[PDB]
Amino acid sequence: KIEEGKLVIWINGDKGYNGLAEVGKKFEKDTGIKVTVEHPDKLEEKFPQVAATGDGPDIIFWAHDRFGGYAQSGLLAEITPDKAFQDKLYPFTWDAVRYNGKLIAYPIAVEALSLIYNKDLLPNPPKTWEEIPALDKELKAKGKSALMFNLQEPYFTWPLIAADGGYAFKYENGKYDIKDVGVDNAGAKAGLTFLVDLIKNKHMNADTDYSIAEAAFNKGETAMTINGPWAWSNIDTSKVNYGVTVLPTFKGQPSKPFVGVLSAGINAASPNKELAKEFLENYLLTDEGLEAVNKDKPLGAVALKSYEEELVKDPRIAATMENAQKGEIMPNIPQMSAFWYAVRTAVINAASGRQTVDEALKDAQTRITK
Numbered sequence: 216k217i218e219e220g221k222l223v224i225w226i227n228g229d230k231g232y233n234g235l236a237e238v239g240k241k242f243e244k245d246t247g248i249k250v251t252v253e254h255p256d257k258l259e260e261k262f263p264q265v266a267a268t269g270d271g272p273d274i275i276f277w278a279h280d281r282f283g284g285y286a287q288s289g290l291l292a293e294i295t296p297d298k299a300f301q302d303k304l305y306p307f308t309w310d311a312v313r314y315n316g317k318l319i320a321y322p323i324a325v326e327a328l329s330l331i332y333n334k335d336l337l338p339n340p341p342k343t344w345e346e347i348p349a350l351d352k353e354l355k356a357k358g359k360s361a362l363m364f365n366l367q368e369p370y371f372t373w374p375l376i377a378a379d380g381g382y383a384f385k386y387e388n389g390k391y392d393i394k395d396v397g398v399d400n401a402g403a404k405a406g407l408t409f410l411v412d413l414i415k416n417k418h419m420n421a422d423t424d425y426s427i428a429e430a431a432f433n434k435g436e437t438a439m440t441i442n443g444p445w446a447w448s449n450i451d452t453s454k455v456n457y458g459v460t461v462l463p464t465f466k467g468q469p470s471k472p473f474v475g476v477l478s479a480g481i482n483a484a485s486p487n488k489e490l491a492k493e494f495l496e497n498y499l500l501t502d503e504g505l506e507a508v509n510k511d512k513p514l515g516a517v518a519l520k521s522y523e524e525e526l527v528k529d530p531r532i533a534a535t536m537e538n539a540q541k542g543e544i545m546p547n548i549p550q551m552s553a554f555w556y557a558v559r560t561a562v563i564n565a566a567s568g569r570q571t572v573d574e575a576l577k578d579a580q581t582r583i584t585k
């Protein structure tokens with residue numbers, strides 16, 4: 216199951232698992248408790264299965280969106296931070312990790328997609344999406360692509376879809392409407408249609424995924440990429456002169472990236488809940504622990520106020536927060552998994568041409584409602 220006396224931690228590969236392992240080494244040096252940090256592939260899907268079995272990580276790291284479904288399943292132990300620690304973290308991050316009136320994960324960092332552009336290839340990033348086709352034509356003349364970003368994951372395409380009116384679920388009266396879904400509305404169709412026109416006009420390739428986009432940007436092949444702060448470390452190693460900026464507007468409206476608070480959830484099956492709480496509150500959710508994770512891969516804005524006051528000074532973090540303000544914090548509700556699956560199918564099918572934009576978004580609407 217979950218072995219006692221040890222912390223097993225699941226965090227995504229793009230995130231700073233090596234820095235988190237450094238925090239775990241500090242935790243071991245102080246407490247005698249080994250912390251093993253693992254980055255299983257598809258961990259957001261894997262943790263529900265193993266946690267339902269009672270196996271799994273002691274601590275699960277993901278964006279909050281997935282923790283509401285976990286808590287509904289009962290996978291997450293209700294975290295019990297005292298009011299002082301909640302004061303240390305930002306209230307909106309706490310709201311992101313609140314599910315059914317209970318805090319079900321520890322917020323670590325706020326992550327929003329930003330437009331990352333190569334300043335040498337692109338001295339000024341386009342302010343609008345509509346500029347990108349002409350910019351791509353000019354760059355293709357130069358042997359370069361204007362924009363390469365992950366098209367397999369709905370999370371990267373979502374800002375374009377949301378910009379003109381697309382939404383996952385209607386939020387009103389402090390309650391998301393699971394029945395009311397905005398992916399097949401006109402604004403979402405406009406965003407997906409623009410993306411598919413970029414693919415059809417060969418400004419973008421439908422097969423482009425996270426690895427291809429990151430490699431193209433880091434090698435200098437593409438002028439722009441859309442990515443979270445975690446990519447900044449690889450761009451820094453690449454030595455590409457890059458800026459992090461607001462996502463381009465679509466139809467005069469800001470791209471709304473779905474805003475994810477990286478969250479640490481304690482497995483309800485874990486016999487190490489006290490050790491996990493100790494690690495997260497006094498080792499991770501501290502300036503030094505967040506610095507260790509951030510140094511491996513930038514976390515974005517951090518839920519911890521004291522570290523974020525230092526982090527906000529970074530222009531890249533400022534762009535992340537600007538894009539987070541323009542975007543919507545994700546709903547953490549259980550329906551969000553189904554929403555992400557349906558939007559993934561819609562974007563992939565529309566990009567490939569397997570389905571029209573309208574057919575894909577209609578199917579996505581039916582599946583996000585279900």
Ligand SMILES: OC[C@H]1O[C@H](O[C@H]2[C@H](O)[C@@H](O)[C@@H](O)O[C@@H]2CO)[C@H](O)[C@@H](O)[C@@H]1O
Nearest residue numbers: 227278280281326368369370371475555
């Ligand atoms: O693409 C759907 C996906 O979106 C979000 O996952 C993000 C995550 O928030 C980022 O930190 C980073 O890992 O990129 C991911 C997308 O590849 C949701 O958190 C996730 O549940 C959802 O499936």
